[PDB]
Symmetry: C3
Subunit: 265 residues, 3 copies
C-alpha cells in the first residue's frame, strides 16, 4: 500500500487511531485520578484538577495507600498519621472541587503488585465508568518509591483488564458491567510529557492545597519543597513557554503494547 514508514506511521496515528493532542480532555464528564499516597493528585496535577472541576467535570480520587509511614515525628504513630492524612486529603480536595475519594487502604510502603489490587481498581472502573484516568507514569527515571511504580503499572493494567468479562468475573455476577467507556489514560509525574496544562494562574492555589497536608509539609520541609515544586512547574511550563505547567503523557491504546516507535510521539 503506502511508500515509506513515515507515511505508514502518520496514517496510523492520524486516521486509523485518530490521535489528537490539542484537547484530549475535551469531552470528559467523569475522571479518576489515581494517587499512590494522600497528596499525590494535588502535587502532580492539582492545578489541572481545579481546571477540570471548574469546567463541570466530575473528579474522583482513588488513593492506593493510607500515608501511614510518612512522618519522622516519633510521637505520631502510623495509625494516628493515617487518620490525620484522610482529613488533610479531604480538605485539600475540597479546595480543588474534588467530589469523592475511594480509599483502598493498602499500607504505605506496602502496596502489593498483584491480581488482587487490579481487581480492586477494576471494581471501581466498572462501577464508575469514567471517561478518563490519571495515574503516575511508572517509567519515570529514578523513581525510587515502589508505591509509585506499582500504582502506575496497576492503573494502566487495570484500565485494560477491566474491559474483559473473564477477568474478575465475580464483578459481572453481582451486576457490574465491564469497563467501557474510558476515552483515555494520562500519565502525570512524567519525564516525557507530550501534553502540558498551563497552571500559571492556579499555582498559588495549588501551593495552598498542597500545604493543607500539614503532616507532610512542616515549615522546615517547605523551605526545600516550595522551591522544588516551583522548579518542577517551571520545567513543564517552559515546554509550552508559560511560567508554571503540569505535564501529562498520552498515547493511543495500541502503544502500551509491543510498539517499537513509542518515542515518535
Amino acid at each position: 500500500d503506502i511508500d515509506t514508514f513515515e507515511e505508514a506511521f502518520n496514517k496510523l496515528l492520524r486516521e486509523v487511531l485518530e490521535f489528537d493532542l490539542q484537547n484530549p480532555f475535551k469531552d470528559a464528564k467523569k475522571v479518576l485520578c489515581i494517587e499512590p499516597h494522600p497528596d499525590d493528585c494535588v502535587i502532580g496535577m492539582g492545578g489541572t484538577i481545579k481546571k477540570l472541576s471548574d469546567m463541570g467535570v466530575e473528579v474522583i480520587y482513588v488513593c492506593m495507600t493510607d500515608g501511614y509511614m510518612g512522618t519522622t515525628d516519633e510521637s505520631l504513630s502510623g495509625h494516628e498519621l493515617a487518620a490525620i492524612r484522610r482529613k488533610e486529603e479531604e480538605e485539600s480536595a475540597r479546595l480543588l472541587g474534588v467530589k469523592k475519594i475511594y480509599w483502598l487502604n493498602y499500607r504505605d510502603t506496602e502496596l502489593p503488585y498483584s491480581r488482587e489490587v487490579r481487581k480492586d481498581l477494576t471494581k471501581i472502573l466498572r462501577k464508575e465508568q469514567p471517561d478518563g484516568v490519571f495515574a503516575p507514569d511508572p517509567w519515570l527515571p529514578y523513581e525510587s518509591h515502589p508505591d509509585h511504580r506499582r500504582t502506575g503499572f496497576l492503573a494502566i493494567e487495570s484500565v485494560a483488564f477491566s474491559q474483559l468479562p473473564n477477568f474478575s468475573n465475580t464483578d459481572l455476577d453481582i451486576g457490574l458491567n465491564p469497563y467501557n467507556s474510558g476515552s483515555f489514560i494520562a500519565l502525570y509525574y512524567t519525564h516525557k510529557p507530550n501534553y502540558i496544562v498551563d497552571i500559571t494562574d492556579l499555582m498559588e492555589l495549588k501551593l495552598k492545597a498542597i500545604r493543607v497536608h500539614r503532616s507532610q509539609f512542616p515549615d522546615d520541609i517547605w523551605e526545600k519543597w516550595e522551591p522544588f515544586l516551583r522548579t518542577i512547574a517551571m520545567f513543564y511550563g517552559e515546554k509550552i513557554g508559560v511560567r508554571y505547567g503540569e505535564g501529562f503523557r498520552i498515547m493511543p491504546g495500541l502503544f502500551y503494547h509491543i510498539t517499537p516507535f513509542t518515542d515518535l510521539i
Copy 2:
C-alpha cells in the same frame, strides 16, 4: 590489553576479538531453537517470517507458550476455559503454516504469569531436555510495554538461559538424568525498540499476516481494521532500518553484556 591506548580501541578489541561478536549471520549453525511467547500468537506476530525462514533452512523450531490466553476476549458468552481450548487450536494451525515442530504449553493463566523461581524451573526443564542452539523471547525493556505477561516472559527467558547452565540450579533435573543447558549459541529478543539485527520478511508478509489471522478469536474484522495497518507499520519500521519494505527485529548481544555492562548502547 593492559597496553591498549583508548577506551574506543579496547571496546572494539573486546567486542570483536575477545568476545568474537558479530552480527553477520547470528542464526548460522542452528539446528534447533526455542521460540518463547507469552500468549498464543506472540511468536507469529513478533517473528513469524523469521520462523518460516528457519523452518525453510531445516531448523527445528519449537514453541514455548507461557500462558493459555484465557482472558483475550470481550465476548461475554465465551468463558476463559472455552477460549483457551480455542486458542490452542488456533496456535496449532498457525504454527503448521510456519513449519513449526512442536509446542510446549506451560498453562499459566493469561494475566497471571508469575515471576518466580518456579517458572524459571519450568523453562530450565525444557532447555535441559531440548538442548536448543538458540532461544527467542520478548525484549522485556521495550518502552511502555504494559502487559506483565510480556515483561515477565522476557526477563524469565533471559535468566533461565543462564541459570539452566548451573548444576546446583533446579538440581533434581540432573538427579533425573537431564544435563545442564549448553548447546546454546544464542539469545535473540523480538518486540524490540533497539534492534541490531533485521531479517527481511518482504515476500513473507502475506504469509505472516495469514498466520496471524488464523487466531480468529483475537482478530475479527473490526479489530483487523486497526491491526493490519499497525502490523504493517511495525514491519516497515524494522524493514526501513536496512532499506527493505518489511522486516522483523531482534536485539542480540554478547552474553557478558546482559550483566554489569555500562556501554550496551554501542551495539
Copy 3:
C-alpha cells in the same frame, strides 16, 4: 521562590543553594560507609579501587552482602553449600586486601533474593545500628541488567535508606533501642551507565584485579581470559570520563531526585 525568571535559573538555584548539591568531593567527610553487593565479589568488581581509597583515608568500610553466591559454579561435584562456604572465605580475603573490615552476610540464596518488606527490614536494622555517613549499591536502572539479584539489591538499598529514617517503619528496631537512620550524607550507585562522579583508579587497577581474582571459584583461567579485558574496558569507559586511564563510576543525586523528579538527566 516566586521571582526567578527561567527554569534554568530555578534549577541552578535549587541544586546549589537549596540542596547544596556538590559533586566535587562527595565522600570528603565520611567516617563510615556501607557497600551493599548482591553477591560476594560485587563490591570489589564494581568499586574495589574506591573502597581501597576510602580505607586509605581511615574511612571504615563495612560490606553487606545480600546473597551467598550458592549457584555460581558449573562444577557438577561442587554443591551450593560447599560453594557458599568457599566464597565466604574468598570474600574475607578479598576484602582484607582492600582494608575491609566487617562483613554483614544476609545469607539469602543466590538467584532467590526476595523483593519484599522483609529484606528492607534486614537492611533497615544494619543502617540503624551502624548509622553510616554514606551507602553504596548497584544502580538498578542499568540497561540490560538481567540478574534479578542486582536489580533487587539496588532498589531495596535505595528504599531502605529512605524508609529506615521513618520511626513507624519496622518499629520494633526502635523498641529494642535502635534509633532511626540519622547519619548518612549520601547514596552512591555503582555499576552505572550514567555516572556523574568518577574516582580515578589508574594506580589501583592492578590491586583491584588481584582482589577480584582471589574469588577463584568465580575466575578460573579460561573465564579470566574474557573477564580481565572486560573489566579493563569497563574501567576505561569510566576513566575516559575524567581524562584518566581507569576509573570507577558512581551516580550521586540529591535525595529529592529519587522521587517525582522529571529532570534527573540535568545532573
